[PDB]
Design a binder for this molecule. Structure first.
Ligand SMILES: Nc1nc2c(ncn2[C@@H]2O[C@H](COP(=O)(O)OP(=O)(O)OP(=O)(O)O)[C@@H](O)[C@H]2O)c(=O)[nH]1
Ligand SMILES: Nc1nc2c(ncn2[C@@H]2O[C@H](COP(=O)(O)OP(=O)(O)O)[C@@H](O)[C@H]2O)c(=O)[nH]1
Ligand SMILES: Nc1nc2c(ncn2[C@@H]2O[C@H](COP(=O)(O)OP(=O)(O)O)[C@@H](O)[C@H]2O)c(=O)[nH]1
Ligand SMILES: [Mg+2]
Lengths: 431, 49, 291, 426, 429
């Protein structure tokens, strides 16, 4: 019971899920072989009578190098031969192809694996998809799979961890195209979406963790940490246990207002960790400051609308209340007028565990923030302007139109994103 | 205090990583010297010719 | 003017070269022993070893004509004084040390491995590091005299200092083989297995290293001088030879970035399982695993 | 997945010969075809270039094409000449005569039947063919005519496959043929319609690299072929080896061609360092970026400073932190925005492969769709206009099945291509 | 706070070679490029002048320049020549011919593009460039004519970085070439326009120091270059080492340039003593002040007594108390108020570095903004007038692209600078 099915779409989804699963195995004491050398693992690991724990995930990429890397690496004995689907040819930075041509030939077997996982589960809380909307197969196949999941499983919760294109760094040129085209799927058939852009995490690593040469490994480890902090309430005991539907209701005020930003504290290296007293107030202030933000979205520029705190460690509810009251008193951040409470917090006694080979320092207490804020309009108000420059002169559109997509789909996605920006601006309007 | 105790072995693991990276840097410098030697041998060969 | 160290080196060169102790050395032998690839100009790349041989002709021709195609130690010493005088103009910091190095390199003197004559790039005692610990060497030998070898069949997992002084020369890097006339033997296609290297140091007791010789080496092509030392792993195990502790150096050029994901997981998992049980019996105080 | 290689003309034969040498060196394959690799990563993607026989022998998926059978014996004498299959050696009995019409209408048509037989055999042997990789010279006869005719028929037979072509553009300084503009124009108008990525190399810039960058004293054509082979391996390094963020032949294309006509790319390689400066250079991503964007490092005689970059791709190889590659590309754009088109943001795609080339900490191959590539087209068109105003040397082509106005269609196609390049440049 | 050093001409190349020898000695760097220093402080701030390679090769940030390849050959053949990066050697086939026109317009212009490419390569690779340090002789052609092109283009490229130019100003007594007036006049107006600090050297003053202060019998160009290398190290001593009172190039510029055009400075180094009298001298802060303010210790030949001090910079090295180093300057001002300008209280800015030069327990460099700097300008301007009035030696310049108009402008600008110096020499409150 309390299962949560993980989906890893596209290359970025595969590495992010790799880091997440390694951290989960370390948290629950599972060997890379799959046997432990308390039914607290059933939420991520499917219990088997042989003593093994098959992970409750579906790796899915239209190109085979990452799944073959998984099939070769240290988790061969952990990961099932299935649930590790390989394609034949990548969508190759083409949303139209990833969602139209080479996506339909694989979504059927993907849904077959999903049905098998759901049947294995008994109290499945929801789906947790991991992808980068920039990549072709990522964006397209994620859109198509979420369409199928929404039309099949009904109102089951679906939380997405999406690596949106960053303000300045982008590894693709048609990445704005893929982002705007996948925004429609991320808005209608994705229950919650979470920004996990790369510049913010790179800067956080180089500031706090003191990493002069950060890579995707550190970013994936931070994403794994925040996902674990989200799911720790349903994995371990706590003073205020919170479920997927719990923070779903307390985080999403309107059906369209569900895109959320995340932040983590205390992000610090081991050498600098013991020089500082990591109190609840300190970690809360570090979260609410833009420095600890995992997104290039400054919350000061907008208004907070809903906040969700995942507290882990020796945090006491009295210190939680004192910190949140201090945050209310603080002026540098302001909440929306119609949501006076605005705060959800779930306390857990389990302290975070640092993965060997990483760079996070072990801490007696930690906190994660998932926030709906009016300031979120800036990332979309940047990506649409990023897209319009290319769309005005019809560059790179022939690739997308030659793979079965109408040229008007671009305009439809742009209009959908414009409406999204419009109602982000509208929800924060003063009464 | 237990968190600090575990942080200490974290730092020792980090130091091990750093010295492994230093060994890697030494290997890469030796590889650069190897390319130097290969070019020098080619020059010697066509000088013989 | 040569001081004591260079005088000793040039005397040793002349003596080792004149096996008859007659003080009369042939010019053909001068060419044979002249390691012209050790010329500083040749190493720089603006000179040919054949040109070094011919400048040796220029230096020694009139004296050889005077002494009937032979050279005296006095004129050899005069040549080396001229070389030392020229060494001042060259740009290294330590002129004297450069002089000993040049003399030894040119005349094949010093810590030279006995079986084949290869000079080590790095001192024999120290364990390999870097390319000397990753790149495979060439298995060489001497056949009646020509040096013949096989490329990339020896792993650099062992210290050459642990070998007997009569067996070290069979193993040499291409760094060392550079500048030496080396015939080569085509290896034989085979699966990726590694032969050991064992030798006898006492009656009934043997010592060696495990799995350094690739199976691509042809046993028939190998001379009888090395077939007695190369052997299969099963044969060595049944023979009960002693194993010198070698070091397995992983190739980093093929280290995937994702390979660093799972390091330390086994040890951390053991620690966390101990923590989990200790919480379950309840001996754990403070940080407790909550399920 | 699989890439099948074809190589035409003596120029293309030598280019592909050194390409197969460098690929076999990277994949641990001796001239006898056996595997001597020291890592498992050298076998997981061996099917991209080498096909396994019943006995385990790896034979390249390569086709040798030439009207002159003399160079076949030179390939035999080559160090790795025994690696290829004998039936993949389609050679004519009569010389090409340095004639595009002879290579395209008379003898090329009669040998291309067997050429397509071999190509279909290799394609059917491939599990899921990714594309064709043809290497040729646009100044010769059989390299230019037969290669482009093969491109045409392969595009007709396989619509979705990628026809990556490595064409050797002639130079005014390295002018070694009087029918060079005839051949070049008769080839480019086939390329513009039948090639997805027609990325060109130029001998004058190869000489420039070998004289100033690598500082060779007496560089033979072996050094040039080594350069083009080492930069040719970089487009498929991401396919043959795992990458932190990789790509393939048309994941590159979808980011490199904004419009279907604009598909000619200019090349670059790094790090290229001389014998003297080998030890003074500290290998780093910054030093790789110092050399990719250097105009005097690029492999064309068309300075990128005279144009503006439409799109670019940096195929980095080696274990390297992604923050520095991203930062380097972003700040190159930011500090040199005058040389990048404002309407396509972040013109440079960056891809990373884990395994570097043998002997290097980190390397990178550069694909550039710069607008300055039209300078070579102007030079070729001017030389043609001069020669055609008086109608010289065309009778050899006309007597070999060439209508005169076919070439004028080709020249109009070049004029349209140059018009597009200049329009997006200004 | 990296500094990129650029070196022009035979004089500039040799002066910079001895300077790099001195810096490598101070920071513990072998000719092979490895670090054999015995202290952590050497490696702590070694990035100021050296960039590390993959294998620990510490390559200087030096751009070496000469239209004649012979000087580049000599610099490579020098004992520390292997330290320099081979690609930083930028040279031409034909020499400047001691022609400022040939250095600035004809031959140096066709080669300046690669020099700027190398300068960008070095400068923008650094974390935060302090600035540039050019060394040249104004009398020569490629040192002055093309060195001025360096200053002009590096100003357009890096407006905010410090620019520091060591020009070996020719003197009538040691004038070993004849077109010195033309070259110096054409280079001084370029230097004054766009250099943060132009810090002059005179060969006859160097010779005087070698003959009398050091009691050398047959001093050579290396002996002359050692003193200027010593001051070259002393100016950035505070940059490269910690101290009780830190300073940098911008601090020196701020405290020594009251007005933009008055950035031509005096040089002085102490202690300087012959080996015979070396052990006869009680070496302390008082004797440091004595020698630093002594006229004969200046290695530019212009007596400070004939003029008045605008500002002074005392860059002291050594582990010493600061009350004495401050009180010495105070006492100097208080009694020699007749030699110091009245309207700048405490004309002397002094800073302390904790690491003295190797082989010395404390030392000091002197940077003097004085009104006697214009005597050399006047004594070469008279020669320039004498040659220019009779149109002598101008065909070589006019045949390369220049004309009388630019010569007249150079003369006018130089005379304007001289008048600006004289006005503050005789200024009253
Ligand atoms: N957080 C994180 N983001 C990544 C990682 N790898 C790639 N990305 C993001 O993904 C973008 C590139 O597209 P990918 O997601 O790799 O491509 P894809 O989803 O596999 O789709 P295709 O391009 O068709 O293969 C980059 O801009 C990155 O922002 C990763 O390891 N961690
Ligand atoms: N880079 C490179 N260029 C070559 C090579 N061989 C020939 N070329 C160029 O190709 C031109 C001649 O082409 P050619 O070999 O006659 O082509 P073919 O007539 O089709 O066989 C010459 O101008 C050379 O510059 C080579 O091995 N490498
Ligand atoms: N201090 C010093 N001065 C020098 C040196 N070499 C030349 N000079 C002076 O420079 C003047 C000539 O400059 P020149 O070499 O022609 O300049 P260039 O043409 O740019 O190389 C002479 O009057 C010398 O006094 C040197 O090594 N040290
Ligand atoms: Mg992918």
């Amino acid at each position: 019971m309390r299962e949560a099915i993980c989906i890893h779409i596209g290359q970025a989804g595969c590495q992010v899920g790799n880091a997440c699963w390694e951290l989960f195995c370390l948290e629950h004491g599972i060997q890379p072989d799959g046997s432990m050398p308390d039914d607290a693992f059933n939420t991520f690991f499917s219990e088997t009578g042989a003593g093994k724990h098959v992970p409750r995930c579906l790796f899915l990429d239209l190109e085979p190098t990452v799944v073959d890397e998984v099939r070769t690496g240290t988790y061969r004995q952990l990961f099932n031969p299935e649930q590790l689907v390989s394609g034949k040819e990548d969508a190759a930075n083409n949303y139209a192809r990833g969602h139209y041509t080479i996506g339909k030939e694989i979504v059927d077997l993907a849904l077959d694996r999903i049905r098998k996982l759901a049947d294995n589960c008994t109290g499945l809380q929801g789906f947790m998809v991991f992808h980068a909307v920039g990549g072709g197969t990522g964006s397209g196949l994620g859109a198509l799979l979420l369409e199928r999941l929404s039309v099949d499983y009904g109102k089951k919760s679906k939380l997405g961890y999406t690596v949106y294109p960053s303000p300045q760094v982008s590894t693709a040129v048609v990445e704005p195209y893929n982002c705007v085209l996948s925004t429609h799927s991320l808005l209608e058939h994705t229950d919650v979406a979470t920004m996990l852009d790369n510049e913010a995490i790179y800067d956080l690593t180089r500031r706090s963790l003191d990493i002069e040469r950060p890579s995707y490994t550190n970013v994936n480890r931070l994403i794994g940490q925040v996902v674990s902090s989200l799911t720790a309430s349903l994995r371990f005991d706590g003073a205020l246990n919170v479920d997927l539907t719990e923070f779903q209701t307390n985080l999403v005020p309107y059906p369209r207002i569900h895109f959320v930003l995340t932040s983590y504290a205390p992000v610090v290296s081991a050498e600098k960790a013991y020089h500082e007293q990591l109190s609840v107030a300190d970690i809360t202030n570090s979260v609410f400051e833009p420095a600890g933000m995992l997104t290039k979205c400054d919350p000061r520029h907008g208004k907070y609308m809903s906040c969700c705190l995942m507290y882990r460690g020796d945090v006491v509810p009295k210190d939680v209340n004192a910190a949140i009251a201090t945050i209310k008193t603080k002026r540098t951040i302001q909440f929306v007028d119609w949501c006076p409470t605005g705060f959800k917090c779930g306390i857990n006694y389990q302290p975070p565990t640092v993965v060997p080979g990483g760079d996070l320092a072990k801490v007696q207490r930690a906190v994660c923030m998932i926030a709906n804020s009016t300031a979120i309009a800036e990332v979309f108000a940047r990506i649409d302007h990023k897209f319009d420059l290319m769309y005005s002169k019809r560059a790179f559109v022939h690739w997308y139109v030659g793979e079965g997509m109408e040229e008007g789909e671009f305009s439809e996605a742009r209009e959908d994103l414009a409406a999204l920006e419009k109602d982000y601006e509208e929800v924060g309007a003063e009464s | 205090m237990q968190v600090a105790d575990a942080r200490y072995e974290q730092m020792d693991a980090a130091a091990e990583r750093r010295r492994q990276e230093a060994a890697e840097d030494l290997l890469y410098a030796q590889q650069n010297a190897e390319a130097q030697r290969v070019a020098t041998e080619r020059v010697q060969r066509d000088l013989e010719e | 003017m040569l001081n004591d160290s260079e005088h000793h080196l040039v005397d040793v060169a002349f003596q080792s070269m004149d096996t008859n102790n007659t003080g009369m050395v042939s010019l053909s032998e001068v060419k044979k022993r002249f390691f012209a690839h050790a010329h500083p100009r040749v190493k720089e790349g603006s000179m040919a070893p054949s040109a070094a041989r011919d400048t040796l002709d220029y230096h020694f021709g009139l004296c050889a004509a005077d002494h009937e195609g032979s050279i005296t130690f006095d004129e050899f010493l005069k040549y080396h004084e001229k070389l030392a005088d020229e060494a001042y103009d060259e740009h290294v910091g330590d002129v004297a040390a450069f002089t000993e190095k040049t003399i030894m390199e040119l005349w094949r003197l010093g810590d030279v491995l006995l079986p084949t004559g290869v000079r080590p790039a790095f001192p024999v005692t120290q364990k390999p590091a870097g390319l000397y610990a990753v790149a495979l060497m060439t298995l060489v030998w001497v056949e009646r005299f020509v040096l013949r070898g096989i490329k990339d069949v020896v792993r650099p997992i062992f210290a050459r200092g642990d070998l007997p002084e009569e067996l070290q020369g069979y193993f040499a890097y291409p760094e060392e083989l550079a500048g030496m006339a080396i015939d080569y033997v085509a290896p034989r296609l085979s699966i990726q297995r590694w032969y050991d290297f064992t030798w006898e140091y006492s009656e009934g007791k043997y010592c060696g290293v495990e799995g350094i010789i690739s199976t691509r080496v042809d046993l028939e092509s190998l001379p009888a001088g090395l077939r007695q030392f190369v052997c299969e792993h099963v044969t060595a195990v049944a023979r009960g030879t002693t194993w010198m502790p070698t070091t397995l150096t992983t190739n980093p050029m093929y280290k995937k970035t994702s390979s660093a994901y799972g390091c330390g997981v086994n040890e951390e998992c053991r620690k966390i399982h101990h923590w989990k049980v200790k919480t379950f019996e309840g001996k754990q105080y403070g940080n407790q695993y909550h399920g | 997945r699989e890439i099948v290689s074809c190589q035409a003309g003596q120029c293309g034969n030598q280019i592909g010969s050194k390409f197969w040498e460098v690929i076999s060196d990277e994949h641990g394959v001796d001239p006898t075809g056996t595997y001597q690799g020291d890592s498992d990563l050298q076998l997981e993607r061996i099917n991209v270039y080498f096909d396994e026989s019943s006995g385990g022998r790896y034979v390249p998926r390569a086709v040798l094409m030439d009207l002159e059978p003399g160079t076949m014996d030179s390939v035999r004498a080559g160090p790795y000449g025994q690696l290829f299959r004998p039936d993949n050696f389609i050679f004519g009995q009569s010389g090409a005569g340095n004639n595009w019409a002879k290579g395209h209408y008379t003898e090329g048509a009669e040998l291309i039947d067997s050429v397509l037989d071999v190509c279909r055999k290799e394609a059917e042997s491939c599990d899921c063919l990714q594309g064709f990789q043809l290497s040729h010279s646009l100044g010769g006869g059989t390299g230019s005519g037969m290669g482009t005719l093969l491109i045409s028929k392969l595009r007709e037979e396989y619509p979705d496959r990628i026809m990556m072509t490595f064409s050797v553009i002639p130079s005014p300084r390295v002018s070694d043929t009087v029918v060079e503009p005839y051949n070049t124009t008769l080839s480019v108008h086939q390329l513009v319609e039948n090639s997805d990525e027609s990325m060109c190399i130029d001998n004058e810039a190869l000489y420039d690299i070998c004289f100033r960058t690598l500082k060779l004293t007496t560089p033979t054509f072996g050094d040039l072929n080594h350069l083009v082979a080492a930069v040719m391996s970089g487009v498929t390094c991401c396919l043959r080896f795992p990458g932190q963020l990789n790509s393939d032949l048309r994941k590159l294309a979808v980011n490199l061609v904004p419009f279907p006509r604009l598909h000619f790319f200019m090349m670059g390689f790094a790090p290229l360092t001389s014998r003297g400066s080998q030890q003074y250079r500290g290998l780093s991503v910054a030093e790789l970026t110092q050399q990719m964007f250097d105009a005097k490092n690029m492999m064309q005689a068309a300075d990128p400073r005279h144009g503006r970059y439409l799109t670019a791709s940096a195929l980095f190889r080696g274990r390297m932190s992604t923050k520095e590659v991203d930062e380097q590309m972003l700040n190159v754009q930011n500090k040199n925005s005058s040389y990048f088109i404002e309407w396509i943001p972040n013109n440079i795609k960056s891809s990373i492969c884990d395994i570097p080339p043998k002997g290097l900490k980190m390397s990178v191959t550069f694909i550039g769709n710069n607008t300055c590539i039209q300078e070579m087209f102007r030079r070729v068109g001017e030389q043609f206009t001069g020669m055609f105003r008086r109608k010289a040397f065309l009778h050899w082509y006309t007597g070999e099945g060439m209508d005169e106005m076919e070439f004028t269609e080709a020249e109009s196609n070049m004029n349209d291509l140059v018009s597009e390049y200049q329009q997006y440049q200004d």
